[PDB]
Design a protein around this ligand. Sequence first.
Ligand SMILES: Nc1nc2c(ncn2[C@@H]2O[C@H](COP(=O)(O)OP(=O)(O)O)[C@@H](O)[C@H]2O)c(=O)[nH]1
Ligand SMILES: *SCc1nc2ccccc2[nH]1
Ligand SMILES: [Mg+2]
Length: 170
Amino acid sequence: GMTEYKLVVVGAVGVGKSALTIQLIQNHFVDEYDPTIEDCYRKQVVIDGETCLLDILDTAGQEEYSAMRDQYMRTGEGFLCVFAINNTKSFEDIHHYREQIKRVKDSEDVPMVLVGNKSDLPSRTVDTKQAQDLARSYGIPFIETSAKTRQGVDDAFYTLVREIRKHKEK
Ligand SMILES: Nc1nc2c(ncn2[C@@H]2O[C@H](COP(=O)(O)OP(=O)(O)O)[C@@H](O)[C@H]2O)c(=O)[nH]1
Ligand SMILES: *SCc1nc2ccccc2[nH]1
Ligand SMILES: [Mg+2]
């Protein structure tokens, strides 16, 4: 089979995880999608000439059993850590997602990309500089996105695939 990249989208409720995923997969903006639904999605794409499958888990937070969270973290190869540029708490929450994923995978080298979503809104509490400072501390890419206009969306997911490739070649 063609290579499949297992991607996991994490972040506080309301940041745009579902909107980002649906924009990536279906090329439309869905402005109301139940915040409590956690589902997988698939898309066959070409990234730098490689035909591959994106197998994406759109997370929704707590699980019936914490074992289910640990399971998807171990299964996932790369993580989109999403905050919204108008939600400071969601930005602060990134520290917890970073820690938890590393903790479950028992790894210091987990492919991740920092994503600041809702860039189409002038209303902003997290400046680009602040997010750059955090991404610098982590040594991971940082991309501002709009699930509404599609700006940065392919970049966010394709960058995560590229980070996974860098991890695999070691
Ligand atoms: N303006 C704007 N609204 C967005 C964007 N992404 C998501 N939203 C809205 O933010 C709300 C939460 O989005 P959702 O995808 O359900 O967030 P999730 O809980 O992280 O899955 C919805 O009302 C979406 O329409 C975006 O990039 N721009
Ligand atoms: S629902 C199929 C599925 N489960 C996943 C876990 C982590 C990353 C991708 C996944 N797809
Ligand atoms: Mg959602």
